[PDB]
Design a binder for this molecule. Structure first.
Ligand SMILES: Nc1ncnc2c1ncn2[C@@H]1O[C@H](COP(=O)(O)OP(=O)(O)O)[C@@H](O)[C@H]1O
Ligand SMILES: Nc1ncnc2c1ncn2[C@@H]1O[C@H](COP(=O)(O)OP(=O)(O)O)[C@@H](O)[C@H]1O
Ligand SMILES: Nc1ncnc2c1ncn2[C@@H]1O[C@H](COP(=O)(O)OP(=O)(O)O)[C@@H](O)[C@H]1O
Ligand SMILES: Nc1ncnc2c1ncn2[C@@H]1O[C@H](COP(=O)(O)OP(=O)(O)O)[C@@H](O)[C@H]1O
Ligand SMILES: [Mg+2]
Ligand SMILES: [Mg+2]
Ligand SMILES: [Mg+2]
Ligand SMILES: [Mg+2]
Lengths: 106, 540, 525, 536, 60
């Protein structure tokens, strides 16, 4: 059968379990969303993004740096979180390639 | 169906027996067993897709949204937010397999789920669940003895590490770190061989420090026959490399002494003040002079120190580390051959450790520094430094290497090895079928069911590898019966041969025996339950 | 009724009075019995209860099950209480007591419904209870030979019986050997605190073990503990109640100095105090050191340098077991550490047991203690294993003090039913019905065995009534054959005190429940 | 729930059987306290202050608001006993509940419900046979006092108990009055043709038996006489009102000079009909329809008594009793409209009688048949309703005694004898059906047990003495006269009830057993229950 | 359920079930014996068998 689509639900109120096709669906759409977000900043004619934070300070940033853009976004997709952490690690290792790695993974 | 006792007295007077009987639930009899079996079947069918080299991973998200990608059944069922008590029993089962063995955490769950799935049909046919549990116990005894029978032995010496690298590679075949398969297996082997009383005695994993740092490549993961610390030298102008380092390990902060008892030193005159002043000066100088006179070229404190001590260390050419943790202090002592000193007066040239290299290591554009201590003579401690492109693969590599270390440990405890690829399960299923042909008719259905359940691991391996379960399993079973060869299993990697003894697919005999024993015992405790009474309140 | 201007009791007082109240009490007791019925016997099942916190408990033990049921019925609380009392005085029979009490009530329900005065019923119950108790004391088999092999056989069989209903029945011979080995080591009070029961998750039941010595889990070691050795081949053991670390010499102590030389002297004095304690501990010859109180990092490293072993924060019970096994005394002061107060074992080790680190003191020949180390795949698996072993251990203790055995499978129940039927056929005719009802009630144990096993309880009870009326006293249910059998020869042995106390408690509960004629619930504040 | 996914609850196995038994037991405990000469009455308050006092088990279970189906079954059982017999409505419920109780006890012991049902069916058959063969008394051997004794036994436990000494006479007389013979010359006693009126006021002892008929009606006009001696009675099933043209008839005037005559016929038509009636000699005219004031004036001037809105059943009874013919129309087979004096009935008197500020009509000494009315007189409407119900039970009992001329003794005699005989008879039938038949036997004892319990006496001792007597009767052929022994609840001692006069119609006990057995079997077959949530 | 688990296609299961159905129709036809409607005893026995399962079986 299946964990969720079973006659009895085996989970606490609020949990969930995306199976084979639904899992790859969420994963691919999230990663590709992250990638399509961070591209268009790629290359000499790349354009910047605005990081209009909604906090009580409403910090404002204008960046073409993929690492900063991905750090400063509220992600809820786990695959997108993976790509975000990957760009952060790229920024730590070297100082360039965070958008190239993000776009490549996507 | 539920709601415990419902009568409300024949006379018409209130009938209240249990507290919140109206809010409480209860399931009795065969329907309770069927609910248990469905829950276990769901858990097992979730896990069976993470089984074998071609097994896939699961991405767990915690309460605060952190992601963990893993193939480890124990880690999955621990990260899994279950509310069904039978699912909790299966989580406990997998955790138990991890505690005792450190591998098999996914096989146990699949096998227990299969045993209960077969008990479902046996109960449908009308057999008492206890008779099912007893037939399963009997068949489990048969399979355990048959494992002892078909088992093989491997050499656990440090001169021929190939059987151990093969075992560790089999363990790490199913994990994401098989991209550096042998590189990972080798170091797991060397780790357990470095830290072990190899007289078939224990392996203390506290002597293996598994450290991870984002950055680098998986290929950079390595074994340091020594220690790594997340600290740097105390002063920024000290040297970043020390060769032939004589180490003084200290748990005394380089600060003026202070009694533990409530004390009040009274200053009553300018002379008392000047005496205090020079006392402080002379204490700092005397500490540094005591550290120098022992001959040390490096100091390692546990409790941090102050500006005067730091500058005196620099001035006297004494590189020094501060704020090292108790466990790291212990590991440095064990590795360098040094003794931990609580005060400077007790410091001597013999209590010092020796490290052939103490280095400060950078990590690119980070500002983060680490301290490596290595090239010790006979370090009984070791570190596995893991690198990678994201924290997910680093943590998965950590747990995968833990599996490999536990496997090498189990080899050091018992050198006997059974051959995997589902071959051991097929052979045990054959043995149980044979012994069932001899028992009285009624415990024969339960032994045949145990055999059909043992056959779920080969089916799962074939299925995850795209093969047809029934076809492949029947063919390899027929071959096993004809040519006596309990090394015939599922070619998950499609190397052509079905002979796992040739493919170097190796499991530990204690591992398989523990899988079988744990699955059978927990299936017994589950079939023995026929009533449930949850709070059922749906509270907050 | 009418509404008074000033009512007598507080508004909300619920009073149930008369024959309906009594029949309702009996029905509540029937409910409580039903809640544990299916746990009876080798074919018995376990119950899973879940608390408000969401923690599940799985048990075959009737006392446990009833403790977990949040029973609030004043009359049904009595069955819970008598199951508790059974677990107290004996340790087995908790389900049998509840079944017997509820069946007494069920059997007298018809006569209660037709207005029979309860005093008559309680008189009949008291009479039949005395008769059945004296009959058990009369026909109980007590071998008067004091032979050691037969006295170990008897305990082994009684333990196997007490365990042939649990999830460890498939190893019950195994566990029975250990249980006897366990209780045959305790000295004269057979203290349960003198038997240690550790639960190490991971492993199989057969991987469980008994250590004729002591074992306890590693206790929050400091730095240097891995530099210590972990095996000793004839160690002397210093058991202490001593905090070994740099500390305020006293909490109400205040040092006052006016000189840096005095300051230095005070610092060195603290250090010399500690080092003096450590030097006394070291010169006593003790290579192993255990403290009920912490042992600091300084002391840890000190003992590591002297090639000694140290463990602090050891629990009081584990310390007393180490004492009773190794043979020393616990010292709050280290100033007189003679070999008289030091302990000794043939082997000390620290090993890994299923993810945990455990210290084993093994080889103690003068040991008045044993330690069970139980393996299993779940906290509740191991907990029910512990409960099963507690049943077996209490059984073995009671048998040691009185080796007077009867047979099980309902053999004794059928014999007492026969004797009481016979007795009832010789009395006027009012007590006749009630004592015959007592007799018919006693039949619930073999009946429930057959039910839980999946037989035709009617036919089997007919066979038993016949074989017990033809001559034959230990014939009861044979479960694996779905038949009857001489259970005394099949070795289904049960200490007589078990059934004696079961009848006593069940009859007392029935008499109490039947004497209540009114229930008055006051409103809760 | 779970796998099924049905939108409802499901009880299964011992649970639902226990529930069914609890429900039946509840219903039986409701009525147990109202059984026998020592049973007591019940109040029932209808959530609005409407009060009902009663001892009738069928009435009690009708007024209750029951939700459980296993309890609705017993309510319907009491209703069926009340329809088919008229007595035994409480005993049948108690017996069905006890059969359910013991049968569920057997099913708990894992005797299959089919076997319990087979045993119950066998025991019912053999109990019926044993009654019909050994426990019946012919009322011919006893005469008329047998009817009085049966009436008194039925009236014991009611509010006309101690006065039975006199009420039974009335009851017996009433049935004898309404006796009529049909084709095959078989005598039929169609009670519900005895009229029963209630009138609070004078004591019960002043209740009246009218040889004739009593109508809860009065004359239509205060100018009419209120007593007529040589009553010639005309029973009409049509109304005497101003004539209205029917739906498909319209008056359309095109010459005003005709309008007057048309209006005049609207009344003269009715006048002519009344004149025809009065032309025959009819002094009393009862009609199911209405009578306009215009017509009442004709009756007034003729010296006649007209009564309107009489009930069809009262009219049928007055017609049958007086010799009259109910006419729906004054129309003959000759296409004209006339009224013959042969269509009249006769009666030696018709009066408007005063009864506690409320008048009724009394038709006394009708010829062509005797009829019967009973005016019950008590302290208030509650008592009067209880008296009506008690009297209906007594009338039904006397009717059954007269149709089938067999009676059985009371006081638990029949149940004790059957308990003995069936506990001895079970030994021959199977091994499990044996247990079922023994339990049927033991269940039958719930009647004397309950009688003694209600009398506040030692049920155990009394029923044991009963069974001892009846065993002596069934094992000693010289002592069969002991069969007639049953309970004496005024002294707590067995007694020869055939000589004491405690008789019950055989059909009462027979039907009680048959219906109780079928009800128990019906409920005892349920092993599952699916209670769906309401559609809304 | 278990067939699907083995890794068989629902189409194969359905067709093999049709095969087993045809064979079972053959088998049941072979088992059967013909009857004449005049055989009142066979009719009474068929009706009794049909009624054995129902509440009306003591009245069969
Ligand atoms: N003059 C140029 N002609 C062609 N390509 C260029 C030129 N200058 C820069 N690039 C390309 O533009 C890219 C800039 O990428 P960048 O936005 O820094 O990516 P990331 O943020 O991933 O480092 C580089 O990959 C480089 O190949
Ligand atoms: N290279 C391989 N070839 C064939 N079978 C393998 C191979 N590696 C692992 N397996 C099988 O896959 C199963 C699952 O192993 P793995 O997923 O590594 O750990 P766990 O047993 O904890 O799931 C084992 O029973 C083993 O028989
Ligand atoms: N092997 C056996 N054969 C028959 N009866 C047994 C056997 N072992 C135990 N019994 C019986 O099972 C009954 C209940 O066992 P259990 O429920 O574990 O004990 P208790 O309810 O007394 O705590 C006892 O009457 C005992 O005599
Ligand atoms: N005078 C009497 N003496 C002894 N028993 C009686 C007497 N009158 C009635 N009984 C018994 O009481 C039972 C029930 O009577 P009753 O309650 O009046 O009728 P029902 O059962 O229809 O309500 C009858 O079966 C009858 O045997
Ligand atoms: Mg593995
Ligand atoms: Mg026991
Ligand atoms: Mg009556
Ligand atoms: Mg049918």
């Amino acid at each position: 059968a299946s964990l969720s689509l079973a006659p009895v639900n085996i989970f606490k109120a609020g949990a969930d379990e995306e199976r084979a096709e639904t899992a790859r669906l969420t994963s691919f759409i999230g990663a590709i969303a992250i990638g399509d977000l961070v591209k268009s900043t790629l290359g000499p004619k790349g354009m910047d993004k605005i990081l209009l934070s909604s906090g009580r300070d409403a910090s404002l940033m204008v960046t073409n740096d993929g690492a900063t853009i991905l750090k400063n976004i509220g992600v809820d997709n786990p695959a997108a979180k993976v790509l975000v952490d990957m760009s952060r690690v790229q920024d730590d290792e070297v100082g360039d390639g965070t958008t190239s790695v993000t776009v490549l993974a996507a | 169906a539920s709601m415990g006792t419902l009568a409300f007295d024949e006379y018409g007077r209130p009938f209240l027996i249990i507290k919140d009987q109206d809010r409480k639930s209860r399931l009795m009899g065969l329907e309770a067993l069927k609910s248990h079996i469905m829950a276990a079947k769901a858990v097992a069918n979730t896990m069976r897709t993470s089984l074998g080299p071609n097994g896939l991973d699961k991405m767990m998200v915690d309460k605060d949204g952190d992601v963990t990608v893993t193939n480890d059944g124990a880690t999955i069922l621990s990260m899994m937010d279950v509310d069904h008590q039978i699912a909790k029993l299966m989580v406990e089962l997998s955790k138990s397999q991890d505690d005792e063995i450190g591998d098999g955490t996914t096989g146990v769950v699949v096998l227990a789920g299969a045993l209960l799935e077969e008990a479902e049909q046996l109960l449908d046919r009308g057999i008492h669940p206890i008779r099912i549990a007893d037939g399963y116990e009997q068949a489990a005894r048969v399979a355990i003895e048959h494992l002892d029978k078909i088992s093989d032995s491997v050499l656990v010496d440090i001169k021929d590490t190939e059987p151990l690298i093969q075992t560790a590679k089999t363990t790490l075949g199913s994990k994401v770190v098989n991209s550096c398969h042998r590189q990972m297996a080798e170091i797991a082997v060397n780790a357990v061989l470095t830290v072990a009383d190899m007289e078939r005695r224990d392996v203390d994993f506290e002597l293996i420090k598994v450290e991870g740092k984002v950055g680098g490549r998986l290929e950079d993961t390595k074994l340091i026959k020594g220690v790594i610390v997340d600290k740097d030298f105390s002063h920024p102008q000290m040297p970043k490399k020390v060769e032939d380092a004589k180490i003084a390990i200290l748990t005394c902060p380089f600060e003026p002494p202070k009694p533990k008892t409530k004390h009040k030193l009274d200053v009553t005159s300018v002379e008392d003040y000047k005496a205090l002043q020079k006392y402080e000066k002379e204490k700092f100088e005397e500490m540094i002079q005591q550290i120098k006179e022992t001959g040390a070229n490096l100091a390692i404190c546990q409790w941090g120190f102050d500006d005067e001590a730091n500058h005196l260390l620099l001035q006297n050419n004494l590189p020094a580390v501060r704020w090292v943790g108790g466990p790291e202090i212990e590991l440095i002592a064990i590795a360098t051959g040094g003794r931990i000193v609580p005060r400077f007066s007790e410091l001597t040239a013999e209590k010092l450790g020796f490290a052939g290299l103490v280095q400060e290591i950078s990590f690119g554009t980070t500002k983060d520094k680490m301290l490596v201590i290595e090239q010790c003579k006979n370090s009984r401690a070791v570190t596995i430094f893991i690198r990678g492109g994201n924290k997910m693969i680093i943590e998965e590599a950590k747990r995968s290497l833990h599996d490999a270390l536990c496997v090498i440990r189990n080899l050091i405890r018992d050198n006997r090895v059974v051959y995997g690829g589902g071959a051991a399960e097929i052979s045990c299923a054959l043995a149980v079928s044979q012994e069932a042909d001899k028992c009285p008719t009624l415990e024969q259905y339960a032994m045949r069911a145990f055999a059909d359940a043992l056959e779920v691991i080969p089916m799962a391996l074939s299925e995850n590898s795209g093969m047809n379960p029934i076809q492949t399993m029947t063919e390899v079973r027929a071959r096993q019966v004809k040519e006596m060869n309990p090394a015939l299993g599922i070619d998950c990697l499609h190397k052509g041969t079905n002979d796992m003894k040739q493919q170097h697919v190796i499991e530990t005999l204690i591992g398989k025996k523990q899988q079988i024993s744990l699955a059978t015992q927990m299936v017994r405790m589950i079939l023995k339950i026929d009533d449930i009474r949850k709070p059922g309140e749906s509270e907050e | 009724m009418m509404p008074t201007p000033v009512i007598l009791l507080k508004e909300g007082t619920d009073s149930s009075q008369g024959i309906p109240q009594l029949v309702s009490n009996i029905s509540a007791c029937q409910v409580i019995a039903e809640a544990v019925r299916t746990t009876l016997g080798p074919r018995g099942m376990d119950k899973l209860i879940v608390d408000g916190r969401g923690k599940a408990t799985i048990s075959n033990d009737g006392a446990t099950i009833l403790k977990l049921l949040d029973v609030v019925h004043p009359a049904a609380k009595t069955l819970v209480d008598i199951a508790k009392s059974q677990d107290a005085e004996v340790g087995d029979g908790t389900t049998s007591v509840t079944l017997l009490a509820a069946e007494f009530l069920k059997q007298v329900k018809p006569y209660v419904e037709e207005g029979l005065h309860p005093q008559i019923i309680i008189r009949a119950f008291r009479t039949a209870t005395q008769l059945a108790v004296n009959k058990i004391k009369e026909i109980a088999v007590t071998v008067k030979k004091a032979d050691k092999v037969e006295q170990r056989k008897l305990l082994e069989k009684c333990a196997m019986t007490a365990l042939s209903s649990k999830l460890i029945s498939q190893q019950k011979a195994f566990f029975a050997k250990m249980v006897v080995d366990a209780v045959m080591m305790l000295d004269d009070l057979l203290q349960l605190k003198m038997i240690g029961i550790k639960k190490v998750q991971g492993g199989a039941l057969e991987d469980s073990q008994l250590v004729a010595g002591v074992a306890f889990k590693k206790t929050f070691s400091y730095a240097g503990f891995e530099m210590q050795p972990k095996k000793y081949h004839n160690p002397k053991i210093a058991l202490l109640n001593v905090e070994l670390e740099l500390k305020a010499e006293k909490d109400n102590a205040e040092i006052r100095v006016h000189t840096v030389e005095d300051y230095q002297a005070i610092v060195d004095a603290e250090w010399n105090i500690l080092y003096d304690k450590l030097e006394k501990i070291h010169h006593s010859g003790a290579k192993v050191v255990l403290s009920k109180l912490p042992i600091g990092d300084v002391a840890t490293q000190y003992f590591a340098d002297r090639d000694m072993f140290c463990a602090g924060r050891v629990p009081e019970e584990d310390l007393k077991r180490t004492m009773m096994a190794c043979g020393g005394s616990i010292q709050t002061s280290v100033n007189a550490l003679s070999a008289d107060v030091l302990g000794r074992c043939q082997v000390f080790e620290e090993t890994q047991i299923g993810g945990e680190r455990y210290n084993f003191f093994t080889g103690c020949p003068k040991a008045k203690t044993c330690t069970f180390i139980l393996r299993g795949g779940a906290e509740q698996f191991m907990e029910e294993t512990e409960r099963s072993l507690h049943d077996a251990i209490m059984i073995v203790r009671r048998a040691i003090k009185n080796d007077s055995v009867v047979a099980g499978g309902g053999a004794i129940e059928m014999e007492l039913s026969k004797y009481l039927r016979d007795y009832s056929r010789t009395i006027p005719g009012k007590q006749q019905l009630l004592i015959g009802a007592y007799a018919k009630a006693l039949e619930i144990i073999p009946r429930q065995l057959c039910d839980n096993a999946g037989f035709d309880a009617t036919n089997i009870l007919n066979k038993l009534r016949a074989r017990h009326a033809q001559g034959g006293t230990w014939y009861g249910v044979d479960i694996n054959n779905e038949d009857i059998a001489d259970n005394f020869e099949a070795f289904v042995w049960e200490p007589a005190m078990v059934r004696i106390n079961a009848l006593t408690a069940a009859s007392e509960a029935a008499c109490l429940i039947v004497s209540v004629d009114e229930t008055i619930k006051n409103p809760r504040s | 729930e779970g796998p099924l996914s049905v939108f409802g609850d499901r009880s299964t196995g011992e649970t639902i059987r226990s529930q069914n038994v609890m429900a039946a037991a509840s219903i039986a405990n409701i009525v147990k306290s109202s059984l026998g000469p020592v049973g007591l009455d019940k109040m029932l308050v209808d959530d609005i202050g409407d009060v009902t006092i009663t001892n009738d088990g069928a009435t009690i279970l009708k007024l209750l608001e029951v939700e459980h189906p296993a309890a609705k079954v017993l309510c319907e059982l009491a209703d069926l006993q009340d329809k088919e017999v008229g007595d035994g409505t409480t005993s049948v419920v108690i017996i069905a509940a006890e059969l359910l109780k013991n049968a569920d006890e057997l099913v708990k012991q894992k005797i299959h419900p089919t076997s319990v049902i087979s045993g119950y069916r066998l025991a019912c058959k053999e109990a019926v046979r044993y009654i019909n063969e050994n426990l019946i008394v012919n009322t011919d051997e006893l005469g008329r006092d047998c009817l009085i004794n049966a009436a008194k036994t039925s009236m014991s436990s009611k509010i006309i108990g101690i006065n039975g000494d006199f009420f039974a006479n009335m009851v017996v007389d009433a049935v004898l009055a309404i006796k009529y013979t049909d084709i095959r010359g078989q005598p039929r006693y169609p009670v519900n043709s005895v009229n029963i009126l209630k009138a609070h006021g004078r004591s019960q002892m002043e209740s009246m038996l009218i040889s004739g008929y009593a109508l809860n009606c009065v004359v239509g006009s205060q100018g009419m006489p209120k007593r007529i001696v040589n009553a010639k009675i005309a029973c009409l099933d049509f109304s005497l009102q101003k004539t209205k043209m029917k739906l498909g008839v319209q008056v359309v005037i095109t010459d005003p000079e005709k309008l007057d005559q048309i209006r005049q016929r609207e009344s003269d038509i009715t006048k002519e009909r009344i004149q025809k009636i009065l032309a025959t000699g009819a002094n009393v005219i009862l009609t199911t329809g209405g009578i306009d004031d215009m017509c009442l004036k004709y009756f007034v001037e003729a010296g006649a008594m007209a009564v309107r809105r009489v009930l069809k059943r009262d009219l049928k009874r007055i017609a049958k009793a007086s010799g009259a013919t109910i006419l729906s129309t004054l129309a003959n087979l000759e296409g004209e409209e006339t009224f013959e004096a042969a269509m009249l009935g006769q009666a030696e008197e018709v009066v408007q009688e005063r009864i506690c500020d409320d008048e009724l009509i009394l038709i006394k000494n009708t010829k062509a048949r005797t009829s019967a009315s009973i005016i019950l007189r008590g302290a208030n409407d509650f008592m009067c309703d209880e008296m009506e119900r008690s009297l209906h039970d007594a009338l039904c009992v006397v009717k059954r005694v007269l149709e089938s001329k067999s009676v059985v003794p009371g006081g638990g005699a029949v149940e004790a004898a059957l308990s003995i005989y069936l506990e001895n008879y079970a030994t021959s039938m199977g091994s499990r059906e044996q247990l079922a038949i023994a339990e049927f036997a033991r269940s039958l004892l719930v009647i004397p047990n309950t009688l003694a319990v209600n009398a506040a006496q030692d049920s155990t001792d009394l029923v044991a003495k009963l069974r001892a007597f009846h065993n002596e009767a069934q094992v000693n052929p010289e002592r069969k006269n002991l069969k007639w022994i049953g309970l004496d609840l005024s002294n707590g001692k067995p007694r020869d009830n055939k000589q004491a006069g405690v008789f019950e119609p055989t059909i009462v006990k027979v039907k009680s057993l048959k219906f109780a057995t079928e009800a128990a079997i019906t409920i005892l077959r349920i092993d599952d229950l699916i209670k769906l949530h309401p559609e809304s | 359920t278990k067939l699907l688990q083995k890794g068989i296609h629902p189409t194969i299961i359905s067709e093999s079930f049709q095969k087993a159905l045809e064979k079972g129709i053959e088998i049941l036809t072979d088992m059967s014996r013909p009857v004449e409607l005049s055989d009142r005893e066979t009719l009474l026995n068929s009706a009794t068998t049909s009624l054995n399962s129902k509440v009306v079986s003591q009245y069969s």
